[PDB]
Nucleic acid binder design. Structure first.
Ligand SMILES: [Mg+2]
Ligand SMILES: [Zn+2]
Ligand SMILES: [Zn+2]
Lengths: 99, 50, 1343, 49, 76
DNA sequence: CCCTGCATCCGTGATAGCACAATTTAACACTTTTGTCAATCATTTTGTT
DNA sequence: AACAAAATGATTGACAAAAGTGTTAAATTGTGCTATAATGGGAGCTGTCACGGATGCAGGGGA
């Protein structure tokens, strides 16, 4: 198998495959403790922000790559903003103190 | 036609594949014995007895 | 967007109206004819934005000049349609409804706040009975429950000045009217008024919630819903499947049911229904709202059009074994395929097909095809990568120049499951892989797939090259030993090359160097292993980094010479002059690393592989059927044991012997005959060949092709060569009881039907545990890495002198782990000295690397005190000095590393694979050392025997250097031979006890008088003559009879005069309690002397298969569980006594120079009436709980216990783990402390030592002293729920219970953590991202 | 399946682990070649446009 | 070409800042601020400078504050 | 008179008519918008006097 | 060697069929009504087991 970019899921915007380019591999919670055991914090910040989930940060990483400038502007993933709307849809209020 | 590894027989104890390999060469020894007698077209009496 | 640093709290009905952009007042979803979303419905368009990007619903405003103008027909605003994903509505409930989380979760917040039992609130929410509100001046207080009939008379009597409501609206008038300050100010008294432990225990439990509801700023009535908020329409979509059918979520069935029963409840109230109906609507509405939030705490409202239960809101957040966010992230730029061998590679590369290199690296190719100028635009380049023109292979070969990719296998156990490799394009469809690397992944090449990722950015390729490359990982982090060991086939090539025959071609000649031997063997003259004499010049680094050649005339073979041409410069020649099995090759690489670094050890671990692969093919080591040889006497060794089993059957059949000794006397003839048929086999392979020298004959070691594979350690053991040739052992029946008849047939001979069926349970049982030891071990290494998640080396030195004493653990007659294995790579807490003092050889705290570890063995040092991480002084982390050295590297630990996660994996990498005559009467020492006892109260009697007094007597075999080598113990009836300091030869019985006789030693001679041992009272009277025979079994208080329990048996032995003959050493007279399983043969009427038994104490102790341990022992030892039978301890040091008995349980008192402590009745105690003990000593016998060691004996007494009881399960199975990895988990198990005295805290709450140690560093540092605490120890499952973050405890444990309690108290998150930082998607605070977090914390508090 | 002349020996590490090493007269004779027959369907829906 | 960064870790003895010193320098080659190359990428050139002693965390700062004095000139 | 012990029970991991009455989508007309088009107005020497 | 001399898009409007803004038809939609006799009843599983925490009865013991 092989995948560079394809069809993304519906509610969470992470990859899956039905269009001849199936989903990406699975970066489990076991393969993330192997990147924290090292100091690989710049491989881990992109392996779960720009390569999978961040909606308006994974297209900039596609124009910076064709333009010969390898650098990322991460942002915040969408799988987390779908968690602030489900913990708010109970009575529970939850926010982000900005400072 | 194929080269296996011998270090898989001591650990996993499948000694069937080492006896099936000798009764393979044996069964194919009577192969090239009927394939030579029947190739010179010797006789159906020298073949019927083997 | 602005940077964020996260809160949580209840939500008011006037805040939920602020998130919402409109009210949802109809259950319709779409239109069914055209699929435009209907108005006011769930999927509305006026409320949750427009459906199409920048356009109204009708179609008037389609252009883009209108960017904000809301339409006038239908007030849709023309914006982007991702705004349909961040907006919310709200339903306006016609009557309140208790939020189920804050009512039915186990400690009910609605419950323990109002102070009403949960069975009595559930009776009021269902309209089953009223509850008085503001009783006023009547005979009714504030929270009475007037039943349905009692209320009738009440209103008949009083019409006003009395108010009792019913339902969900009554619980609001109780919460809304209660005053929180007049409740908390008053209960400050009641906590001090009541004199009771359970009374003032629950009282503070309600006085803390009331004090957490007034400090955070939440009203109490916010736990009762008044408006419900609805999710955005694009997180609960109704997407149309292909074919005409729609595929909705199942949140549209639970929202369309809250809007119906709420819309019908408005019709029923404006219609003036009878009250018997609008009670069935209120209780029916709030049952649909409590199936929305959390479905299952009620009748489990099953889905419609199907039969499985719906998925409520609290089931999406609730764990699937992972959080909803990142603890899962499927990932772009990746592939996967089958792996194969490819042994032509270096150590830092890997194959990668041209079909995956052209699809993983696609956007990198469109950058070159336009920079190089071949394609004009980026669409025109998308075709050239489709047709695969001759140039794209020129650009794909250039994009892959120095770009490392990250290979990673499926079940990543430890950190070496992800490594990087520099790709090299091959053709095919399988990812090749270097052979030395597969032993780290644990990969066979028989169908194993391996995903390959790609690091994109520029700071993510300098990490896959400096941190995660394949040549940087040569030492495993669990223990410092190497992990690139040449595995299985390159070790059978090294072995065959470096053996020696006795007469081969070219024997005895003399060569002139390794270039002359290889030129002689390849020429066909000399055999590969013939005994030659060569001249080799080896170097050695002795000065300040130099080498000095040293030519000699070595005596070797043509094999060891050809292999000397590979070894680097600075190595000796005696490193390759062995027979070079498998352990000698991983020791040849361990020395080559320490002496020459990493450059020659990576370029030497290859050349050892190209020489083992090449000279293993020249063997043709093929295993025939003449190889596995059956011994000549396998038949007589079995027939002899086949007739010798009949002589134990014939005796039993004639009834001479029972069934118990019939079995064990047959199992011991087979199991001892199985050994003679194996030991008669390895004496046939190992000395197989008998070669001829120039003259007579001679023997040697064999070249049997199936023995070399077992002797080199290449593949197999010696307990498996005995199943191909020897006998196939004894096979255990299903329950575990061993079969009496053993399978006596090998695999070179067949097995009949009846023996192959018996051998199946031993196989079917093995495959049913290897699938269970993984699912049970993948849950131990997930709780460990969530308690040790947030530990990080964050300082260079703290300055504490408190370490732990490191000595070699000595198990009885042998030492298990030397002192070099335990202290290697650890700072020294203080300076150690020689046997002569003031001779400080090791300086102040220095890393005990190789030189200081050999210098300790050069001298005879016995113990060192090293600094452990369990006692470091830093706040939120550990210093780099307290931790130590050991790593994949060898230097000290680098500041910023993440030592919490690499210590939870090295404990969880094993366990997946390892799930599981003896007389000993005479203490047999294998050595010749002086006997030196300590901590004993016992002296020699008349006959020459030190009277045993208690269980405090151990044996120390002091060596010739002032150390110890052996440790023993002393039981009752302990006979003795020597004294103290008198030398003993190896294996001389110094102190002994019979197996089936642990008799009552006589301390002093004299009369025996009957005190609680008359007939009937504690022991019956039995007959015999003066020979002294009987079966008088004096029963203990747990072997005691039914009625006679007010007596405790003992013999208050009087001297010849009849007075109290006191045992010298205390004040008590001689009263030797007849120990467990006692047989008092000496009735009252026999006067005896020293050494003569007062009661016979046998002991079976047979088989040894009556033990515990394994994987369940290591998870339970970490949870800190009470082991069902505590061994009580002496809290405060003093004197002993008894008290009033038969209170159901006895009692005890200890007097310091008033303390009381009661005891059970079955406990065979281990103290007399008067006794002087030390703080933290046993009083009874049993498995000491883990907490009791902590509260009494200290903290270093619990770390020396958790370590040795867990290392005792691994080293029993051959697993290596450095025990720094069991102290950085114990350090996270006792980080909570409870306060005793105060002046700054609340004097009874359980705070963290991180905080209880900053106050006292703050207050006591100022001019006031103004608290004292006591460490707690709670298991790794309850020690993770109680963190100070709530996203690090909600992502792992029960999530409903953690968001419920974190919300009421209004918590906050710095995050300040790894598992809480990876979720938000930013740089973790440990590793390469540690530099940025320090640079960001100092941007706060500055500017 | 087919039955082919097998020889047990370690050959330069191309059969290091369980992996196998196959000659090229086994690919010429075309004896392990299999046939596979897939089905692709192209439906013609009736949209609303 | 590179197989081990053991030389670079000698100069900068951390391995967590050598990844931060070389990513900052390797950007400069990538965006053509600067040209101190045997057909190598920009991340193996940044490691063959640190290996040789011509780059570290101080030589990058002082060469940047000498940029402002340059920018101050044209700043007029 | 008083605090204090054994056993359950619970959560949490691994069968229509109609006859109305009102509402909608669509089929056929408008005028501004933008094109294709030439008889004078403008800025372009073919080669006479 | 200047100005014969003749176009050739500019420059002017005219023409065109192209194109959004309103009035009725036909199919869609929602509300009411419909007197022989009807009456506490609808209703799935069951062979995991583990530990740990509140809750309530009971003995058991200090005043
Ligand atoms: Mg496998
Ligand atoms: Zn509109
Ligand atoms: Zn420290």
């Amino acid at each position: 198998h092989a995948r560079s970019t394809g069809s993304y899921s519906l509610v969470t915007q992470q990859p899956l495959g039905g269009k001849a380019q199936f989903g990406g591999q699975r970066f489990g919670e076991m393969e993330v403790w192997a990147l924290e055991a090292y100091g690989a914090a710049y491989t881990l910040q992109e392996m779960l922000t720009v390569k999978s989930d961040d909606v308006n940060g994974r297209t900039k990483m596609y124009k910076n790559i064709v333009d010969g400038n390898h650098q990322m502007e991460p942002g915040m993933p969408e799988s987390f903003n779908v968690l602030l709307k489900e913990i708010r849809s109970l009575g529970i209020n939850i926010e982000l103190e900005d400072e | 036609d194929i080269v296996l590894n011998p270090l898989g027989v001591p650990s996993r104890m499948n000694i069937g594949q080492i006896l099936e390999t000798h009764l393979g060469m044996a069964a194919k020894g009577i192969g090239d014995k009927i394939n030579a007698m029947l190739k010179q077209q010797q006789e159906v009496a020298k073949l019927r007895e083997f | 967007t602005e940077e964020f640093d996260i809160k949580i709290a209840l939500a008011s009905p006037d805040m939920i109206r602020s998130w919402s952009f409109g009210e949802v007042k109809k259950p319709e979803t779409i239109n069914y004819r055209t699929f435009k979303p209907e108005r006011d419905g769930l999927f509305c368009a006026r409320i949750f934005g427009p459906v199409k990007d920048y356009e109204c619903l009708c179609g008037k405003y389609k252009r883009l000049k209108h960017r904000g103008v809301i339409c006038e027909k239908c007030g849709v605003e023309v914006t982007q349609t991702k705004v349909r994903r961040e907006r919310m509505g709200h339903i306006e409930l016609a009557s309140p409804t208790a939020h189920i989380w804050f009512l039915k979760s186990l400690p009910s917040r609605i419950g323990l706040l109002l102070d009403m039992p949960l069975r009595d609130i559930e009776r009021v929410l269902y309209f089953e009975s009223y509850v008085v509100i503001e009783g006023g001046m009547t005979n009714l207080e504030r929270q009475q429950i007037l039943t349905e009939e009692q209320y009738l008379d009440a209103l008949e009597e009083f019409g006003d000045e009395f108010d009792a409501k019913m339902g969900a609206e009554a619980i609001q008038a109780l919460l809304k009217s209660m005053d929180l300050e007049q409740e908390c100010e008053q209960l400050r008294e009641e906590l001090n008024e009541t004199n009771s432990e359970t009374k003032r225990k629950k009282l503070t439990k309600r006085i803390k919630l009331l004090e957490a509801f007034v400090q955070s700023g939440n009203k109490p009535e916010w736990m009762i819903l008044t408006v419900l908020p609805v999710l955005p329409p694009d997180l609960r979509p109704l997407v149309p499947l292909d074919g005409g059918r729609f595929a909705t979520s199942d949140l549209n069935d639970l929202y369309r049911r809250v809007i119906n029963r709420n819309n019908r409840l408005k019709r029923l109230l404006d219609l003036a229904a009878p009250d018997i109906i609008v009670r069935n609507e209120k209780r029916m509405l709030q049952e649909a709202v409590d199936a929305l939030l959390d479905n299952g705490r009620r009748g489990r409202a099953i889905t419609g059009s199907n039969k499985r239960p719906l998925k409520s809101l609290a089931d999406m957040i609730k764990g699937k074994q992972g959080r909803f966010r990142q603890n899962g992230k499927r990932v772009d730029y990746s592939g996967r395929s089958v792996i194969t061998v490819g042994p032509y590679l270096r150590l830092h590369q890997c194959g990668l097909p041209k079909k995956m290199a052209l699809e993983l690296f696609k956007p990198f190719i469109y950058g070159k095809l336009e920079l190089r100028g071949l394609a004009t635009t980026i669409k025109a380049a998308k075709k050239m990568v489709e047709r695969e023109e001759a140039v794209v292979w020129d650009i794909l070969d250039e994009v892959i120049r120095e770009h490392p990719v990250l290979l990673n296998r499926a079940p990543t156990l430890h950190r070496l499951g992800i490594q990087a490799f520099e790709p090299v394009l091959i053709e095919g469809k399988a990812i090749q892989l270097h052979p030395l690397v597969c032993a780290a992944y644990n990969a066979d090449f028989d169908g194993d797939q391996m995903a390959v990722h790609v690091p994109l950015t520029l700071e993510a390729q300098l990490e896959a090259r400096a941190l995660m490359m394949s040549t940087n990982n040569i030492l495993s982090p669990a223990n410092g030993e190497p992990i690139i060991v040449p595995s299985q086939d390159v070790v059978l090539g090294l072995y065959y090359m470096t053996r020696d025959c006795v007469n081969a071609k070219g024997e005895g000649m003399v060569l002139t160097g390794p270039k002359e031997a290889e030129r002689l063997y390849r020429s066909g003259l000399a055999s590969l292993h013939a005994r030659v004499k060569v001249r080799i010049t080896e170097y050695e680094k002795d000065a300040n980094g130099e080498l000095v050649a040293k030519t000699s005339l070595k005596d070797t073979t043509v094999g060891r010479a050809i292999l000397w041409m590979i070894v680097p410069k600075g190595l000796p020649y005696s490193i390759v002059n062995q027979a070079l099995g498998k352990k000698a090759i991983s020791k040849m690489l361990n020395t080559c690393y320490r002496i020459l670094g990493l450059k020659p050890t990576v370029i030497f671990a290859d050349q050892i592989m190209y020489t083992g692969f090449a000279y293993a093919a020249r063997s043709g080591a093929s295993v025939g059927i003449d190889d596995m040889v059956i011994p000549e006497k396998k038949h007589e060794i079995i027939s002899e044991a086949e007739a010798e089993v009949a002589e134990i059957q014939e005796q039993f059949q004639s009834g001479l012997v029972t069934a118990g000794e019939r079995y064990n006397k047959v199992i011991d003839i087979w199991a001892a005959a199985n050994d003679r048929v194996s030991k008669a086999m390895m004496d046939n392979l190992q000395t197989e060949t008998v070669i001829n020298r120039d003259g007579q004959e001679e023997k040697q070691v064999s070249f049997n092709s199936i023995y070399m594979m077992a002797d080199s350690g290449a593949r197999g053991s010696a307990a498996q060569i005995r199943q191909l040739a020897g006998m196939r052992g004894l096979m255990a029946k299903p329950d575990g009881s061993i079969i009496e008849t053993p399978i006596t047939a090998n695999f070179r001979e067949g097995l009949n039907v009846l023996q192959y069926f018996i051998s199946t349970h031993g196989a079917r049982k093995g495959l049913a545990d290897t699938a269970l030891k993984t699912a049970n071990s993948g849950y131990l290494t997930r709780r460990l890495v969530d308690v040790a998640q947030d530990l990080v080396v964050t300082e260079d030195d703290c300055g504490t002198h408190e370490g732990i004493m490191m000595t070699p653990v000595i198990e009885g007659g042998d030492v298990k782990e030397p002192l070099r294995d335990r202290v290697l790579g650890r700072v020294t807490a203080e300076d150690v000295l020689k046997p002569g003092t003031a001779d400080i050889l090791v300086p102040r705290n220095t890393l005990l690397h190789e030189q200081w570890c050999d210098l300790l063995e050069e001298n005879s040092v016995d113990a060192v005190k090293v600094r452990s991480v369990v006692s470091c002084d830093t706040d939120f982390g550990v210093c780099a000095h307290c931790y130590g050295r050991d790593l994949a590297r060898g230097h000290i630990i680098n500041k910023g590393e993440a030592i919490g996660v690499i210590a939870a994996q090295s404990i969880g990498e094993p366990g997946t694979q390892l799930t599981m005559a003896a007389a000993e009467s005479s203490i047999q020492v294998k050595n010749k050392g002086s006997i030196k006892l300590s901590n004993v109260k016992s002296v020699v009697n008349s006959s020459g025997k030190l009277v045993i007094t208690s269980r405090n007597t151990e044996l120390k075999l002091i060596d010739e250097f002032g150390r110890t080598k052996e440790s023993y113990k002393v039981p009752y009836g302990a006979v003795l031979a020597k004294g103290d300091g008198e030398q003993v030869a190896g294996g001389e019985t110094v102190a002994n006890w019979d197996p089936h006789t642990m008799p009552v030693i006589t301390e002093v001679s004299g009369f025996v008088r009957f005190t609680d041992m008359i007939d009937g009272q504690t022991i019956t009277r039995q007959t015999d003559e003066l020979t002294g025979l009987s079966s008088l079994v004096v029963l203990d208080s747990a072997e005691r009879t039914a009625g006679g329990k007010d007596l405790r048996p003992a013999l208050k032995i009087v001297d010849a005069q009849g007075n109290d003959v006191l045992i010298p050493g205390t004040d008590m007279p001689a009263q030797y309690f007849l120990p467990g399983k006692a047989i008092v043969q000496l009735e009252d009427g026999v006067q005896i002397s020293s050494g003569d038994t007062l009661a016979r104490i046998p002991q079976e102790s047979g088989g040894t298969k009556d033990i515990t341990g394994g994987l369940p022992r290591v998870a339970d030892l970490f949870e800190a569980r009470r082991p069902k039978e505590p061994a009580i301890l002496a809290e405060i040091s003093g004197i002993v006594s008894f008290g009033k008995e038969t209170k159901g349980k006895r009692r005890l008192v200890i007097t310091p120079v008033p303390y009381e402590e009661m005891i059970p009745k079955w406990r065979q105690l281990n103290v007399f009436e008067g006794e002087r003990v030390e703080r933290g000593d046993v009083i009874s016998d049993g498995p000491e709980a883990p907490h009791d060691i902590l509260r009494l004996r200290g903290v270093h007494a619990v770390t020396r216990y958790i370590v040795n009881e867990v290392q005792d399960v691994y080293r029993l199975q051959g697993v290596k783990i450095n025990d720094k990895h069991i102290e950085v988990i114990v350090r996270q198990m006792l980080r909570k402390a409870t306060i005793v005295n105060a002046g700054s805290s609340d004097f009874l709450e359980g705070e963290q030592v991180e905080y209880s140690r900053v106050k006292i560093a703050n207050r006591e540092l100022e001019a006031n002293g103004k608290a004292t605490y006591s460490r707690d120890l709670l298991g790794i499952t309850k020690a993770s729920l109680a963190t100070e973050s709530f996203i690090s405890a909600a992502s792992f444990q029960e999530t409903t219970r953690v968001l419920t309690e974190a919300a009421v108290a209004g918590k906050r998150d710095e995050l300040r953590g790894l598992k809480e930082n990876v979720i938000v998607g930013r740089l973790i605070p440990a590793g390469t991202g540690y530099a940025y977090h320090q640079d960001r914390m100092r941007r706060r508090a500055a500017g | 399946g087919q039955n082919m002349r097998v020889a047990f020996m370690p050959w330069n590490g191309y059969n290091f682990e369980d992996s196998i090493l196959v000659s090229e007269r086994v690919v010429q004779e075309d004896r392990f070649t299999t046939i596979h027959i897939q089905e692709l369907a192209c439906v013609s829906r009736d949209t609303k446009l | 070409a590179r197989v081990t960064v053991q030389d670079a870790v000698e100069k900068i003895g951390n391995r967590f800042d050598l990844v931060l010193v070389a990513a900052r320098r390797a950007r400069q080659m990538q965006v053509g601020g600067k040209d101190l190359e045997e057909n190598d990428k920009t991340t193996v050139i940044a490691l063959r400078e640190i290996e040789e002693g011509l780059i570290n965390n101080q030589i990058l700062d002082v060469r940047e504050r000498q940029e402002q004095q340059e920018q101050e000139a044209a700043e007029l």
